[PDB]
Each structure stands twice: as C-alpha cells, then as structure tokens.
CSV table of C-alpha atoms and ligand atoms in Angstrom, one decimal:
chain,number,residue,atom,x,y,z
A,1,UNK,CA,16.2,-42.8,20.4
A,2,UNK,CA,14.2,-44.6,17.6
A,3,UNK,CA,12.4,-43.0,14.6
A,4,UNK,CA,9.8,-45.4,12.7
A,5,UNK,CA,8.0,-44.1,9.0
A,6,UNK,CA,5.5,-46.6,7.1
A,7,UNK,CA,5.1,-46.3,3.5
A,8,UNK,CA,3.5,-48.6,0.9
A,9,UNK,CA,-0.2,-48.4,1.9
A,10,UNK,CA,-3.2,-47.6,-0.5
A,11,UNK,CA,-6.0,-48.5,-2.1
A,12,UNK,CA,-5.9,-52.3,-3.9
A,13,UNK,CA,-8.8,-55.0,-4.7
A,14,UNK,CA,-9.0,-58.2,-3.1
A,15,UNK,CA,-6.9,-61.5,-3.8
A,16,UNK,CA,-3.9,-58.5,-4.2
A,17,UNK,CA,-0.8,-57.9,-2.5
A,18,UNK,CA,0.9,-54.5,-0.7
A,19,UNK,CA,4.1,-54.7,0.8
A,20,UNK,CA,4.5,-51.7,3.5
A,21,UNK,CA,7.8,-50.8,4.8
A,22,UNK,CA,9.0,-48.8,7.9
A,23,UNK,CA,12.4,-46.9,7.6
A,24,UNK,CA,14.0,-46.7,11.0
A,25,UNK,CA,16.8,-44.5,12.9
A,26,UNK,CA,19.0,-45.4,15.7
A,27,UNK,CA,22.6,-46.5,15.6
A,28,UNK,CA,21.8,-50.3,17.3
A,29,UNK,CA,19.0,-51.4,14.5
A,30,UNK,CA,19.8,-55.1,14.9
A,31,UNK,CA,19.2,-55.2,18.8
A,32,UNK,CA,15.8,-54.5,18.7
A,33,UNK,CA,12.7,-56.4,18.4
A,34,UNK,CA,10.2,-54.7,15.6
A,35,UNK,CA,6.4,-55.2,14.9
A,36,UNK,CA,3.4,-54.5,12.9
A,37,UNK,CA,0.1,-53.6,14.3
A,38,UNK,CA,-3.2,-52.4,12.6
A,39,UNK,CA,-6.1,-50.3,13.6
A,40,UNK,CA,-9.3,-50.8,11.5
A,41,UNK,CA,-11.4,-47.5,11.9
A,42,UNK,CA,-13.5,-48.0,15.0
A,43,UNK,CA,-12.1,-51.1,16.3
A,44,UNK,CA,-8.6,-51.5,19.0
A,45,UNK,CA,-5.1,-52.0,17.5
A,46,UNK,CA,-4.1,-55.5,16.4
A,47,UNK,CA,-1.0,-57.3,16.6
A,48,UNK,CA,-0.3,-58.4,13.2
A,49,UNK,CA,3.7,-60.0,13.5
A,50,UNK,CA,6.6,-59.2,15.2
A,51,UNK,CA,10.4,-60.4,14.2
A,52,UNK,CA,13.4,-61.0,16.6
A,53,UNK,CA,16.3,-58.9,17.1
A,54,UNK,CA,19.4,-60.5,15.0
A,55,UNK,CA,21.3,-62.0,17.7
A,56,UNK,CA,18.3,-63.9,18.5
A,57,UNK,CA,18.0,-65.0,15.0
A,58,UNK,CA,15.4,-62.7,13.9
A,59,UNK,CA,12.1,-65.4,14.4
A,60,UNK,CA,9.0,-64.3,13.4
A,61,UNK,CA,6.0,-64.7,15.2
A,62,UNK,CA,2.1,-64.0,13.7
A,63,UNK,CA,-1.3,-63.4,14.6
A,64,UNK,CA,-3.4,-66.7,13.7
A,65,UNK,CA,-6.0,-64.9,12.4
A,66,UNK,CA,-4.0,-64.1,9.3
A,67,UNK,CA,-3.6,-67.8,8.0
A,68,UNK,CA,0.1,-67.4,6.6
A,69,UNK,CA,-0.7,-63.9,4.3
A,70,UNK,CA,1.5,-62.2,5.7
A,71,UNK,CA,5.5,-62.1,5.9
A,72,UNK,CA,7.4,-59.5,8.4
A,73,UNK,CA,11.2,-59.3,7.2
A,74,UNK,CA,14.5,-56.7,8.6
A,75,UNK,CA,17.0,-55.4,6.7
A,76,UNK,CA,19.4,-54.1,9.4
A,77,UNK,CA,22.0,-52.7,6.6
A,78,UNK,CA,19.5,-50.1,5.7
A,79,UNK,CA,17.5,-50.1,9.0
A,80,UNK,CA,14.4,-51.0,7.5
A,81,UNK,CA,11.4,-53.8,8.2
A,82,UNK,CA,8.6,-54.9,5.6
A,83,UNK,CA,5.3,-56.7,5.5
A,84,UNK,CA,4.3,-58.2,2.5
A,85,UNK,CA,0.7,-58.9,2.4
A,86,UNK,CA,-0.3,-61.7,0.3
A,87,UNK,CA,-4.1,-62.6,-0.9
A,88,UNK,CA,-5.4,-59.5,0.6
A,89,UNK,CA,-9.5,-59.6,2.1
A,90,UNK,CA,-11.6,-57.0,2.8
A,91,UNK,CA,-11.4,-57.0,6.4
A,92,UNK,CA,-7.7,-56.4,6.4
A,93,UNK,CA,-8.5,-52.6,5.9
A,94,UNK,CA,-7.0,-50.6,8.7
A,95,UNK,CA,-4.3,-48.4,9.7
A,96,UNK,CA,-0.7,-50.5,10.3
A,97,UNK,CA,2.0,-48.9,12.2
A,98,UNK,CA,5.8,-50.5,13.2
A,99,UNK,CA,6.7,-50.3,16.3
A,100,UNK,CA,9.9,-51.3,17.9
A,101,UNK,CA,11.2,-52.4,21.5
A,102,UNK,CA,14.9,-51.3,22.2
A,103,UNK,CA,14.8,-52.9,25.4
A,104,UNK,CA,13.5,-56.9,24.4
A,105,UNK,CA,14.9,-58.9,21.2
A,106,UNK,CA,12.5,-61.3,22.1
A,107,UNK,CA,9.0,-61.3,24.4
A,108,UNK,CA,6.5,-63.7,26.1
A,109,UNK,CA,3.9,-61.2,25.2
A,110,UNK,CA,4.9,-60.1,22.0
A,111,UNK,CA,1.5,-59.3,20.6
A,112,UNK,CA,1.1,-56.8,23.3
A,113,UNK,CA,1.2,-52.6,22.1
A,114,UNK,CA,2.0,-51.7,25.7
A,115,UNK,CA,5.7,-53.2,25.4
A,116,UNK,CA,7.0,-51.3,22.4
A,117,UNK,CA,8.6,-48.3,23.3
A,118,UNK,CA,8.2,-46.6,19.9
A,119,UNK,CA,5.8,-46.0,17.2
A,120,UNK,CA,5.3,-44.7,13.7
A,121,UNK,CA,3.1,-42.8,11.9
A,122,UNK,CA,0.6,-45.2,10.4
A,123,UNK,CA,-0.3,-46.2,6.4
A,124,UNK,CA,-3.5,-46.4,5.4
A,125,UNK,CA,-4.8,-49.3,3.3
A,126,UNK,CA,-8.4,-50.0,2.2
A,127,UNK,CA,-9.1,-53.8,0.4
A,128,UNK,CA,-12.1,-53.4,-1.7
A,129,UNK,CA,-14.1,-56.2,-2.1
B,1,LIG,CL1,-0.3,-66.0,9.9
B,2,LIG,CL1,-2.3,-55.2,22.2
C-alpha cells in the first residue's frame, strides 16, 4: 500500500545540522499519520516525532529527550516528510527510519513501533564529537 525511502544521512561534526527526508507512495498521503524512529547500533529503536494526518491538522508530537532539535514536517503535494536536525550531539548517532500508519491520523501511543503499519529502509548518520 505504502512505500517509505530515507535519504539525507551521513557523516557531520557536532553543533551541525542534517535534514533526512522519506519519499513516500500511496494515492491517500494526507490521511496518514507519519514518524521518525532511530536505532543506535546495539541499543532498541526510538521514537524520535511523529506528525498528524492533514485533516487533523498535521500536529507534531516529540520525544523529550531531544530538547526542541528536531522539527518533523509533510509535504503531501510531493508525498514526502522531513526531519531537520538542529545542534546535532554525539549520541544522536543511529539509524532513523519513517514509518507511517494508514489506519490512525492521530494516536494515544504514538511513540509506539508496533502501531505503524509500514517502514522504510533506514539512513545512517554518525555525529562525531
Ligand atoms: Cl524535542
Ligand atoms: Cl517503541
């Protein structure tokens, strides 16, 4: 139904910026809830922020742990979503994948990886000290 694809990761020094972006497939973009998670080697995957379906307004919700860094934002013209990543810190290296829902605009338990029903790839990004 849904196809997800990250770009945008690499390599980059602390106090930088990356923004990664997921291009998406599936006819009803704008009805779906969208996320970013991230997997540091070794460690479980994280919720990192999530952003509303349109007809919910498109809200945006964040872990706390990130102290306002990071922006999620949808472009439902081009079927795309984007994380900027602002002031970048070593332990911010990981894998990040989007992930979408086509069944919730909106969820309780947002920050939960068992409720989206579709995943992409992964990008890698290392934060060097
Ligand atoms: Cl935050
Ligand atoms: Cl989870």
């Amino acid at each position: 139904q849904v196809q997800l694809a990250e770009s945008g990761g690499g390599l980059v020094q602390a106090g930088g910026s990356l923004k990664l972006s997921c291009a998406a497939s599936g006819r009803d973009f704008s009805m779906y809830m969208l996320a970013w998670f991230r997997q540091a080697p070794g460690k479980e995957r994280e919720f990192v922020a999530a952003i509303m379906c349109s007809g919910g307004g498109g809200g945006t919700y964040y872990a706390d742990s990130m102290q306002g860094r990071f922006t999620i934002s949808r472009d439902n013209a081009k079927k795309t979503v984007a994380l900027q990543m602002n002031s970048l810190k070593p332990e911010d290296t990981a894998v990040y994948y989007c992930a979408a829902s086509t069944t919730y605009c909106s969820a309780t338990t947002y920050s939960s990886d068992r409720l989206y029903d579709f995943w992409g790839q992964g990008t890698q990004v290392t934060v060097s000290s």
